[PDB]
Design a binder for these strands. Structure first.
Ligand SMILES: [Mg+2]
Ligand SMILES: [Mg+2]
Ligand SMILES: [Zn+2]
Ligand SMILES: [Zn+2]
Lengths: 72, 926, 132, 125
RNA sequence: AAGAAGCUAU
RNA sequence: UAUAGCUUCUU
């Protein structure tokens, strides 16, 4: 259940990067720190809390239609 | 009784408190430098021949001052008084008192030395050249007693560490003035001995920490005016401590006073030769060997090392802006230029170019390449830089903006991950886990990585030991041939690599190899043998799988450097990689039985054998410049018939100016590299091996010379130690008949397998336990005092069972498996590495397994030896890869049969999902 | 003969690779949300649903117990679902409301908000709170 | 085919020669021929270290500040002295290349800027 | 043996 | 940068 979290974190950081998030230096720094922390984690609780913190970054923007992609 | 303490306390108004018991002698454990026709070494011996009393300042507080009283004989009691009467007027001679006392019925002579320090200089040198983190009480006491720190500073664990807690350098630098005053008093004592004739040998243990000399038991008279002190062992053993404690810091102040402002030099001054000569004549006056401030005047590389060692120390007191390329204005068709016509090395001096053209009519292609390759023109037209993010020297900014380069994450290969999970992989509690990923980096990563050159510090070496070590190391490279080749015989592969700055703005190595003819390349190479060509190195971040964040950078050196270094080093580098059965195993493959052959060659015929392997913390950043110079000189001994002294020196200067102190570009800005190795050079992996072998030989020399010679049962090893000490500190020339013997002794009891900064040693366990060969502790101390790093014993392994192979070598493990009928050694990787390489990729088109089926074939070739592992979870990786290859082919066939209306009649692709194509890669005879 | 077969294999490979990198964004987003759904975490699911219907955060969600979090509420139904008096429930945690301002940057008190009186302020409020 | 490949190589040799020679002549026009000449005319021989050319003749300075504490002690105010010379600020940008104002650089508003800050100044006579 | 291309590991 | 190995095509 940790490999799934790490793979999804990798994909989330890829999505954020291709959404042009590195144009902002501090936001990119925070995202990179969270992504690297998730990979090196050892317990699922801290990994999941960091994962939600990093997903909040993508949710706060408006460049990814959420309802359309949640069409199951 | 209270009469010996009253006579010892003569008319001096001193209050003494006994340290022993009455008149009974006091036994101590102190370091000595002994050579007395029966024992030789720098070791720790028991000293019980003197009674020691302590002096109290006032009230009831003890101070650091002792009254050592000795009792040897009657004949010596007159000789040491006759010598003292001649040396009594010197200010560097400890006050002596002579008196006669009766113990029971005899009049025992006594010699008293007044107001001595608890420890001597030999103790200070031994504590720092034989450092043990678990037993360092002498060093702690010396540090605390002289107000370097407080007793609580040692509660901070990792205090000794250099990489961590770099305040230990500031703590150590608190003994610099004490060491400097000791050196001054040594010079005074040498002059006093020279006057009236007191010819004798100066030893470290005969001087206390105040700088006073007190032992005259081995001196002999002579005609006043001609007396020679012997100061080889003293200075040579004290050399490494003069840079750790920064002894000569006070030489940069106005009147050599630490309370006055720093001397201010003219910004245009670069020669500094008279100052170097004055420093040498002030601190090392009786060192009996000519010193050349500029190494261009040296006689051979053995003299170049000797003089560069002194330059390393003397150059720490001069402004850092006086080092680097020396530029001047030339006129090309009348329009002024600014070019580099020299160089000022901290180690080689003030080298000057010989082919400077002040007036030119045209500008050829070779001249164009030379001029648009040095930093003079780029920096002269740049902007001033004050980068506050790093402590490294900054030269100029070549633009108006600062570049912040980042690293992106990896690419998830979801199909392979789903396939692996569907076959019971990554289950909770499994032994196979994902540990290697693609880590991302922000804009500060490049400068953060560059600022790791703060681990490079000016290191002074023990020259009398380094010379012998280099002579022994040169024997490991005898079975090779080298020399200079022509432009035709250069075999360059991958012509589409980088060309460095500024040449990467117009093309790759292909554009410059195709543009220049053979005549132009030969002319450029011959130019570098008479002139120095500074170049610029470009740093970039790399995109690869790893197990730590640890941003990684790749350096690309300019074409003008590689093109000329190839014609100098290619023959030797290609001969090193074509030899099997040697210590250096570069170029030896692990397939077709290579790993077994290498393992059985390292094992050789050692007795009571064990296996050991160590680590080099921050190898590329902390390596001292002297060791890099030594490696470069050792690799250039093949040019004994194709180059002269001047040609070889100028090639060495070019190497130093191009790959050792070059100007590095990072984010569109120019900095100054203090030292270390660069990954962009072709000779890095070959100089790393020389440095590794040099360190391994120094460890053995230190292990053998620091052993009590009276406890060595074998009569051959004892004489070997005696003659080793003699060849180091008492014989100023090369002894081949002993270099050969030491090389044979090391090869029989200390077998190594070296690949750059990676080694495996099979040694004689009994000898290592008796202190006759090196162990891990010797490596720790050697690295501490010669590399400015602490080597944790947790990063080093040991293996008593030789049938289980080395624990790790080149990131691979060893297993003794059964192939056919015999038993062989096979290397296998970390399963997590293979799984991560399969699951995460660095390109979106590599995530479609159908278009890339050879990636998995190559990955399964490396994962085969896992099928013979006892663990069944490790052995499933090979089968998973085979199944994935089969499924990929099955899917690709259908995809091609639908996208088109054709199918391959014959494929011959079934060999890749069967366990024979991969099993044949580890069987010999191919 | 083989010349033609190997030519077709090269042509197919070029067609696929040129199409693999021509659909990176949509494929990556689809994969990310498929994996997020498969993870099935309450903390992630709550925020995903809230962002889907009404609630989107204005800054990275803090993990400490003191850092401030600001959220966006589109209407009153989301306020009922997520806001119950003086307590805020978001991302599987308890948040205490500290200050609410309507869409025109005019401060608003909690007691004012109700159902009938909802159509009297700039609805897209901005609620701030701190972790328990 | 040998002749065609040689012609391509012979063409690229002149193509890169112009680039190398054009770069060198462009840098000639950025050299302060009357300020860089003063220091060279003072050297006892004519040779000077390359490290003191930008230090004593450059007309523009660029400072990279990691945080506000370093800004306070290095480039505070409008004019600051570095390398025994007086420099006057001209512009300030952050890690995103946006223009920053000296008023926004405070100890309370500090945690709102992309902090790697590049301060460019002009030598004042 | 010469090459031209692709890939994997150290 | 250097080393080693695998697959394809031409001479
Ligand atoms: Mg003695
Ligand atoms: Mg290893
Ligand atoms: Zn010399
Ligand atoms: Zn040569």
């Amino acid at each position: 259940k940790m490999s799934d979290v790490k793979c999804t974190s990798v994909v989330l950081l890829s999505v954020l990067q291709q959404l042009r998030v590195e144009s902002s230096s501090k936001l990119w720094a925070q995202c990179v720190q969270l992504h690297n922390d998730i990979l090196l984690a050892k317990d699922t609780t801290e990994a999941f809390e960091k994962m939600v913190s990093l997903l909040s970054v993508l949710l706060s923007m408006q460049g990814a239609v959420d309802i359309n992609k949640l069409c199951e | 009784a209270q009469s010996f303490l009253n006579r010892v306390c003569g008319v001096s108004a001193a209050r003494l408190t006994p340290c022993g018991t009455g008149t009974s002698t006091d036994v101590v454990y102190r370091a000595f430098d002994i050579y007395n026709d029966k024992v030789a070494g720098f070791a720790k011996f028991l000293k019980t021949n003197c009674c020691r009393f302590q002096e109290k300042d006032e009230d009831d507080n003890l101070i650091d001052s002792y009254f050592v009283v000795k009792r040897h004989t009657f004949s010596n009691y007159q000789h040491e008084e006759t010598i003292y009467n001649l040396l009594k007027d010197c200010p560097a001679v400890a006050k002596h008192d002579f008196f006669k006392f009766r113990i029971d019925g005899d009049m025992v002579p006594h010699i008293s030395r007044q107001r001595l320090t608890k420890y001597t200089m030999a103790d200070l040198v031994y504590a720092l050249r034989h450092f043990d983190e678990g037993n360092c009480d002498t060093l702690k006491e010396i540090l605390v007693t002289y107000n370097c720190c407080d007793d609580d500073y040692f509660n901070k664990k990792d205090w000794y560490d250099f990489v961590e807690n770099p305040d230990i350098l500031r703590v150590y630098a608190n003994l610099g003035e004490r060491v400097r005053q000791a050196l001054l008093k040594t010079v005074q004592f040498c002059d006093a001995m020279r006057n009236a004739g007191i010819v004798g040998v100066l030893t470290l243990d005969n001087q206390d920490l105040n700088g006073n000399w007190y032992d005259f038991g081995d001196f002999i008279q002579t005609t006043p005016g001609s007396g020679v002190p012997v100061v080889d062992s003293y200075y040579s053993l004290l050399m490494p401590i003069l840079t750790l404690t920064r002894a000569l810091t006070a030489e940069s102040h106005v009147d050599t006073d630490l309370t006055k402002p720093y001397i201010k030099w003219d910004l245009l001054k670069y020669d500094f030769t008279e100052e170097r000569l004055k420093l040498f004549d002030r601190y090392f006056k009786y060192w009996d060997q000519t010193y050349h401030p500029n190494c261009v005047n040296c006689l051979d590389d053995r003299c170049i090392l000797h003089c560069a060692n002194f330059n390393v120390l003397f150059s720490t007191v001069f402004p850092p802006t006086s080092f680097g390329p020396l530029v001047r204005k030339i006129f090309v068709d009348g329009v002024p230029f600014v070019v580099s016509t020299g160089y000022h090395f901290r180690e080689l001096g003030v080298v000057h170019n010989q082919d400077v053209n002040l007036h030119s009519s045209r500008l050829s292609f070779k001249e164009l390449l030379v001029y648009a390759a040095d930093p003079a023109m780029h920096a002269a037209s740049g902007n001033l830089l004050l980068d506050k993010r790093t402590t490294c020297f900054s030269v100029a900014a070549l633009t108006n903006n600062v570049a912040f380069q980042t690293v992106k994450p990896g690419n998830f290969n979801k199909d392979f991950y789903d396939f692996a999970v569907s076959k019971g992989f990554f289950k909770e509690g499994s032994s196979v886990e994902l540990k290697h990923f693609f880590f991302a980096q922000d804009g500060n990563a490049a400068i953060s990585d560059y600022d790791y050159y703060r681990y490079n510090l000016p290191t002074m070496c023990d020259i009398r030991q380094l010379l012998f070590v280099v002579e022994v190391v040169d024997k490991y490279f005898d079975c090779y041939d080298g020399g200079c080749i022509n432009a035709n015989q250069v075999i360059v592969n991958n012509l589409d690599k980088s060309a460095g700055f500024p040449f990467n703005k117009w093309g790759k190595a292909r554009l410059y190899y195709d543009s220049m003819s053979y005549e132009d390349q030969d002319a450029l190479f011959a130019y570098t043998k008479r002139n120095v060509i500074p170049t610029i190195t470009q740093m970039n971040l790399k995109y690869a799988i790893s197990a730590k964040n640890r941003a990684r950078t790749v350096a690309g050196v300019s074409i003008c450097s590689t093109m000329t270094n190839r014609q100098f080093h290619q023959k030797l580098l290609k001969s090193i990689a074509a030899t099997r059965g040697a210590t250096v195993v570069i170029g030896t493959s692990k397939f077709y039985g290579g790993w077994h052959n290498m393992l059985k060659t390292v094992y050789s015929d050692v007795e009571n054998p064990h296996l050991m392997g160590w680590d080099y913390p921050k190898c590329d950043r902390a390596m001292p410049n002297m060791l890099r110079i030594m490696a470069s000189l050792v690799l250039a001994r093949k040019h004994t018939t194709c180059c002269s002294l001047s040609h070889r020196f100028y090639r060495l200067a070019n190497e130093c100016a191009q790959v050792l102190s070059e100007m590095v570009m990072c984010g569109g800005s120019l900095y100054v590299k203090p030292g270390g190795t660069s990954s962009g050079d072709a000779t890095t992996a070959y100089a790393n091996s020389v440095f590794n072998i040099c360190q391994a030989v120094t460890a053995n020399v230190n292990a053998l010379l620091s052993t009590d010679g009276n406890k060595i049962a074998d009569k051959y090893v004892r004489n070997l130690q005696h003659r080793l000490y003699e060849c180091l500190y008492r014989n100023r020339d090369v002894d081949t008949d002993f270099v050969n013997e030491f090389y044979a002794y090391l090869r029989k009891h200390f077998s190594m397998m070296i690949l750059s900064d990676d080694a495996v040693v099979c040694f004689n366990s009994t000898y290592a336990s008796q202190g006759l060969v090196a162990s891990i502790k010797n490596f720790k101390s050697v690295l501490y005092y010669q590399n400015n790093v602490f080597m944790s014993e947790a990063k080093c392994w040991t293996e008593t069972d030789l049938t289980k192979g080395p624990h790790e070598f080149c990131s691979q493990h060893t297993m003794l498996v059964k192939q056919g009928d015999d038993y062989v050694y096979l290397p296998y990787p970390d399963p997590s590495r293979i799984l991560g390489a399969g699951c995460f990729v660095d390109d979106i088109v590599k995530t479609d397994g159908t278009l890339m089926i050879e990636r998995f074939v190559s990955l399964a070739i490396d994962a085969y030896p896992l099928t013979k592992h006892p663990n069944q979870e490790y052995a499933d990786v090979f089968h998973l890869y085979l199944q994935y290859i089969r499924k990929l082919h099955d899917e690709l066939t259908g995809h091609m049969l639908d996208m088109y209306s054709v199918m391959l009649t014959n494929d011959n692709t079934s060999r890749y999902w069967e366990p024979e194509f991969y099993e044949a890669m580890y069987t010999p005879h191919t | 003969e083989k010349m033609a077969d190997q030519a077709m294999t090269q042509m197919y490979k070029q067609a696929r690779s040129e199409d693999k990198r021509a659909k990176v964004t949509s494929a990556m987003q689809t994969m990310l949300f498929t994996m997020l759904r498969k993870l099935d975490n309450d903390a992630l699911n709550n925020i995903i649903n809230n962002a889907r219907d009404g609630c989107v955060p204005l800054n990275i969600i803090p993990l400490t117990t003191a850092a401030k979090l600001m959220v966006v509420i589109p209407d009153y139904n989301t306020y009922k679902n997520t806001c119950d008096g003086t307590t805020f429930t978001y991302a599987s945690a308890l948040w205490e409301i500290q200050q609410v301002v309507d869409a025109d940057s005019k401060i608003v008190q909690l007691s004012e908000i109700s159902m009938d009186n909802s159509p009297n302020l700039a609805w897209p409020l901005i609620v701030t709170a701190l972790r328990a």
